[PDB]
Design a protein around this ligand. Sequence first.
Ligand SMILES: [Br-]
Ligand SMILES: [Br-]
Ligand SMILES: [Br-]
Ligand SMILES: [Br-]
Ligand SMILES: [Br-]
Ligand SMILES: [Br-]
Ligand SMILES: [Br-]
Ligand SMILES: [Br-]
Ligand SMILES: [Br-]
Length: 155
Amino acid sequence: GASIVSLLGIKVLNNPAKFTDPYEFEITFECLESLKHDLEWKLTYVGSSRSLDHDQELDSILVGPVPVGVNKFVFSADPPSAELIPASELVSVTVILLSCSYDGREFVRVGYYVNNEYDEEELRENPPAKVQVDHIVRNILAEKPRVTRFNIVWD
Ligand SMILES: [Br-]
Ligand SMILES: [Br-]
Ligand SMILES: [Br-]
Ligand SMILES: [Br-]
Ligand SMILES: [Br-]
Ligand SMILES: [Br-]
Ligand SMILES: [Br-]
Ligand SMILES: [Br-]
Ligand SMILES: [Br-]
């Protein structure tokens, strides 16, 4: 049948923000019938393939047992370790992926580009090799999400 769960709404909260501030999304979804499993929402920091920071699962939350109908919650996750961020992640945009899975099967993914920019000109012109995370302003490009749905088996 149709997907048991549909994504109805997503709001990126507290954006822009310090690099060290939690990511926060207010999510509205609906669930059409009772499910055996909870939903697993997770946020993945895609990072940079050249470094040791890539494809990090920041946090997950088990949501359920989900009452049939419209549901709303806030997904929060702390940012990845400042210790692993390479200087290139200021230069080029990075990606964060908010996804939901059911019994390990991903059925919806929302991707966002994230522009990290130093908050003073000298840093922007002459960025230090030791990434000064405390001077990064994180801007999630919230008006250009990439939403992908996957057809999964439910129960
Ligand atoms: Br709203
Ligand atoms: Br808020
Ligand atoms: Br409603
Ligand atoms: Br994507
Ligand atoms: Br910059
Ligand atoms: Br945007
Ligand atoms: Br489906
Ligand atoms: Br689908
Ligand atoms: Br499947």
